């Protein structure tokens, strides 16, 4: 384009234009997208705040002569390999003084973003760089999978030993190199390009090729090794630092695995996540089964799958979601979760309240609801709910939120029936679109899996506390769901809880319940060090529902003995139901000692804010001791810590405990430093 | 029955008869089944061996006044709770001097084997007892799930405040107790059985019941807490000790979860594993959808599911399988895997060999094949293959085996297509039986999951080394399998490998291959501390198959430039294929350094036996150092250890290294004890 006001970026650097022709942002332009998203982050938090350009810094990372990563400022497109990375230092609302993370990305313009050995080792090197520092690792996927190739240098000289030069159509015995060929190879110092066995047949000496190696690196299995290297590297990263991936253009083979292994993923619409392309699969099946890769790995697959946690309309939207997601996680591994108080202060009642005879969206209880007569506040901070995995297993709702500024993972139950429509596979003619009815308050294979996935994702890397508004009748025990292994997924939940490292709150909501099958997987004893359970005064819980209980312990016979109190079975049947229901109250739960407290929904925000803040504080103190006295149970630690509180402080008063502790952090630190004396030598 | 030769056991103890009427062995008779199975174990190993009754000892475990477990010899049926346990000490072929394990079981005759709080705490107490000692925990499931009940004492006295004594059909306002009732309760010291509010209405004073608590323990949520307690307890046990469960009669609710959480499970035919019973589910759906619980949790569900690893014709068969399974695992956590040499010695060639143009069952390569001209030996010890999870995801084959006596987990690939027939769910009228074609050498969601499950099951509790005869073309990238999340299951494999703690051998078989998608998940770099890869001289590996490679790097144009070597596309197309194929040889793998060695199938048993034995030995030495010098990478440890070998010993000679090490264990132990001097104070 001639005569533009400013320089034509796409001309100054043709690679930028190639990227665009490919439907993705040029890799070197992504740091600018992060600056833009970060700026927006501020405007949304505080319209005023005068922001300067030093609030965002991006330094490209490359390997020095010794293979170690260092920072450089160079012209975009100078990358010698197809993988690039940047260290981002950015001041944000949660971290005004700045937080850091790295961004690794394929360069779709460099050999179609293929993963060659060098790209793989660079990617691995960047992952370790992030893990060592404990900072988040953002991956931007735009690739063609493992790099392929043949030893081109052997193509113009190989000879074929036919069964008879007369009719080639008769076949060949092997391929070989003449003494002339062996020479052409030695002339270019490419003798290792081939493995041969010198044998003379009638005419001349023919070196039979037993194996083709090639002089150029990155043709086959060496690309597979590096492929596995970064797969395992990413598997580890996920249990270590916050990991996330943006699928910004196709992501193929190892590319698709990196997306899942990183777990948290945002798919830009129209950018497929595939294993094998449609053309190839069509060859596998014989006919023209698939039209595009989007049928195999588009958002309708992966987002409905749970592989993609969120979809983005474009690259910038993807970056914004990443930035939004990061606002809930620690600046780095083991640092405190980022407190961020906003307009919606902790001290207030909860407005929206569910009713037994009225349908509702659990999201209203979570983030509040907008009504004609004004906004009704929910349990958590207004506008702080960030839902994820929203395109899969709608039976359960998961996301991040803030409670008076405290970030945490939230799991709620969708009470409304879900219409899960499964498309028909083109590969099968006899296939027809299928509709699955997923009853509310019932775990299914998908929703059980999602529940566990969320717990693990809240725990690993995010290191967030969690609240589960437990409200399930049980798991689906029908044949299809049972055959579909609902037990394995249900069990994944218990496993996830056992592994949780931050405070957990299990709370049965106002019109909610827990029964024999559901309570099993969320009881506080699964992980007593982190879990606490609470039931609303209007919640219910017992092994069986009232109907089921009477149908077994208040049979027709016993129902008649009661006729001796005053045809009339209808009303008496109702009486027995109420008799049973009077057993499933929060009061019995308190009496039997299975919950910490029974609560009143409207007061829940106030109670949980201080309960959580109080816990974050004691936990902090407990960890400090776990690095001193060492050998000591949690019971002994938490007890010693509480022995330091002033005698008149009421251990049961959350607000008092939290308040006294924050007033004496340094004083408590002195008592700890002085405890080092307990250095059993 | 009168006039029997010996006492009528079922009469002496009626509970034994009740158990039988229920289709299961009386709990106290199970130890005898273990003795029988153990005796058989010997006969099968050595027909001769004169066995005495002291080779098997079973001591029931009960809680003493302080709640601690102790041994007792008492009359069967004296159990005050519905859960029982035994400590078994038994000499076996693998452990001639004896090995121990515990057996916990529901007593189906005690309150239908329901899980009450006491049963739950006993079960938990036994699990910890086993974990502390590091011994296997066998669970025999025969139950009705969580115990239920109502406060019976409140049934004969509750009163109802009708809207008008005239027409009860009009409803009631609440239930209450008269001053007479409150007295009946105080007379039996059951005042807490109810929560009321004294209010006087016209007539007398009526105490409105707000909550029914009940005096008897085990009615509701207290059964749910204990339920969650043992769920989490079992979740932990699985990552700690060898865990296994025999479903000997129905296993309900928490009962079904215990089976999965324990992971390894053997289902006796006709004994259902269910969440909710058919009658109840029929109520849920309205109509008479299900006939029996077997439709919901019978072997056709759970065995085809992968929830049940094996099925047994009867209780005794179940016990035998348990005993057989245990013969491959350490007597207790962290003890060496049980070496058990048999007739089939290590020093011999492998007979059965696959052919490219011939269908075969991978089991033949594993355990050998019986033919008309005699027995053809496989890679592993004759008769040592114990397949598991054989009713699910047949695309992959898993089991335990012995290599010259060394036990290990084995994973092989089923090359034959699998006909996976999925029954139709009665709940859906529009449902029809479905047939799934699972191509061989291709991972599917189920087979990927099974592959990972096996790795985790070999690692946790079993603590076994592993060999994977890696032979997959890739994962199924079609729509259905992609939508069914094959990526998540594929990723589970990488996770399992990362967590493996024993030596691992990845070996591409004689006619096998690995490609871009499959190699990703089994490369040695995923876990370099334990993994080693090998390729047969007749194996193949590269990113793409030859067809795919030519279709991209040897297009029609380039194919014509080759026409200048001597219509004839057919033969030249064949030529290009061979050109590509010459790239995917074990030789290139060795050159690029991606495998430890290329091998010859017939010599594999000899090579692997000494390679594994050599490794088990170095690993042992490495752990000893990991308890001394501590802070040191594996590279530094393995290096120091090898520095102790005699200078003339060839580190690369497996047999020599293993042999010298076993000759100097004690001498090496002295060098270690002397290394304690390195006690950086
Ligand atoms: C339902 C389903 C889904 C995915 C499956 C994947 C495989 C293995 C891979 C290995 C690697 N591979 C090839 O290497 C290959 C690629 C291409 C191809 C490449 C680029 C464009 C178009 C086609 N064409 C071929 C034809 C015949 C044999 C192999 C090929 C693809 C095939 C096997 C069964 C499958 N079944
Ligand atoms: C496809 C599917 C499969 C399993 C499902 C499980 C539930 C929850 C449980 C809670 C506990 N429960 C009861 O408590 C109950 C039990 C029995 C019952 C008990 C013994 C014998 C026969 C029936 N009858 C009832 C009728 C109405 C309401 C509840 C009951 C069973 C119902 C919800 C939806 C389901 N959908």
PDB file of C-alpha atoms in Angstrom, chain B residues 61 63 69 83-85 102-105 115 119-139 229-245 258 261-262 333:
ATOM      1  CA  UNK B  61      -8.646 -58.051  64.520  1.00  0.00           C
ATOM      2  CA  UNK B  63     -10.689 -52.857  68.784  1.00  0.00           C
ATOM      3  CA  UNK B  69      -6.693 -53.012  67.066  1.00  0.00           C
ATOM      4  CA  UNK B  83     -17.488 -54.803  59.789  1.00  0.00           C
ATOM      5  CA  UNK B  84     -14.800 -57.419  60.439  1.00  0.00           C
ATOM      6  CA  UNK B  85     -11.085 -57.871  59.732  1.00  0.00           C
ATOM      7  CA  UNK B 102      -5.223 -57.595  56.188  1.00  0.00           C
ATOM      8  CA  UNK B 103      -8.729 -58.478  55.107  1.00  0.00           C
ATOM      9  CA  UNK B 104     -11.632 -56.144  55.960  1.00  0.00           C
ATOM     10  CA  UNK B 105     -15.144 -57.182  55.108  1.00  0.00           C
ATOM     11  CA  UNK B 115     -22.283 -48.800  56.905  1.00  0.00           C
ATOM     12  CA  UNK B 119     -18.400 -49.804  60.875  1.00  0.00           C
ATOM     13  CA  UNK B 120     -16.897 -46.783  59.132  1.00  0.00           C
ATOM     14  CA  UNK B 121     -14.485 -45.957  61.914  1.00  0.00           C
ATOM     15  CA  UNK B 122     -13.462 -49.624  62.185  1.00  0.00           C
ATOM     16  CA  UNK B 123     -12.846 -49.785  58.431  1.00  0.00           C
ATOM     17  CA  UNK B 124     -10.809 -46.577  58.636  1.00  0.00           C
ATOM     18  CA  UNK B 125      -8.878 -47.891  61.640  1.00  0.00           C
ATOM     19  CA  UNK B 126      -7.995 -51.111  59.749  1.00  0.00           C
ATOM     20  CA  UNK B 127      -6.896 -49.166  56.652  1.00  0.00           C
ATOM     21  CA  UNK B 128      -4.481 -47.069  58.740  1.00  0.00           C
ATOM     22  CA  UNK B 129      -3.286 -50.228  60.495  1.00  0.00           C
ATOM     23  CA  UNK B 130      -2.330 -51.615  57.094  1.00  0.00           C
ATOM     24  CA  UNK B 131      -0.812 -48.367  55.828  1.00  0.00           C
ATOM     25  CA  UNK B 132       1.365 -47.928  58.910  1.00  0.00           C
ATOM     26  CA  UNK B 133       2.768 -51.445  58.429  1.00  0.00           C
ATOM     27  CA  UNK B 134       2.899 -51.091  54.647  1.00  0.00           C
ATOM     28  CA  UNK B 135       0.967 -54.303  54.027  1.00  0.00           C
ATOM     29  CA  UNK B 136      -1.758 -54.983  51.419  1.00  0.00           C
ATOM     30  CA  UNK B 137      -5.361 -54.204  52.300  1.00  0.00           C
ATOM     31  CA  UNK B 138      -7.919 -56.601  50.859  1.00  0.00           C
ATOM     32  CA  UNK B 139     -11.551 -55.471  51.102  1.00  0.00           C
ATOM     33  CA  UNK B 229     -14.087 -40.655  55.941  1.00  0.00           C
ATOM     34  CA  UNK B 230     -13.424 -44.096  54.491  1.00  0.00           C
ATOM     35  CA  UNK B 231     -13.704 -42.804  50.929  1.00  0.00           C
ATOM     36  CA  UNK B 232     -10.807 -40.434  51.514  1.00  0.00           C
ATOM     37  CA  UNK B 233      -9.060 -43.114  53.546  1.00  0.00           C
ATOM     38  CA  UNK B 234      -9.222 -45.525  50.615  1.00  0.00           C
ATOM     39  CA  UNK B 235      -8.142 -42.817  48.164  1.00  0.00           C
ATOM     40  CA  UNK B 236      -4.961 -42.426  50.227  1.00  0.00           C
ATOM     41  CA  UNK B 237      -4.441 -46.160  50.747  1.00  0.00           C
ATOM     42  CA  UNK B 238      -4.267 -46.665  46.974  1.00  0.00           C
ATOM     43  CA  UNK B 239      -1.234 -44.363  46.630  1.00  0.00           C
ATOM     44  CA  UNK B 240       0.339 -46.033  49.631  1.00  0.00           C
ATOM     45  CA  UNK B 241      -0.195 -49.804  49.871  1.00  0.00           C
ATOM     46  CA  UNK B 242      -1.439 -52.488  47.532  1.00  0.00           C
ATOM     47  CA  UNK B 243      -5.246 -52.256  47.545  1.00  0.00           C
ATOM     48  CA  UNK B 244      -7.799 -54.677  46.099  1.00  0.00           C
ATOM     49  CA  UNK B 245     -11.515 -55.379  46.474  1.00  0.00           C
ATOM     50  CA  UNK B 258     -14.920 -48.068  47.930  1.00  0.00           C
ATOM     51  CA  UNK B 261     -11.324 -45.893  45.062  1.00  0.00           C
ATOM     52  CA  UNK B 262      -9.438 -49.084  45.831  1.00  0.00           C
ATOM     53  CA  UNK B 333       5.656 -51.111  50.783  1.00  0.00           C
TER      54      UNK B 333
END
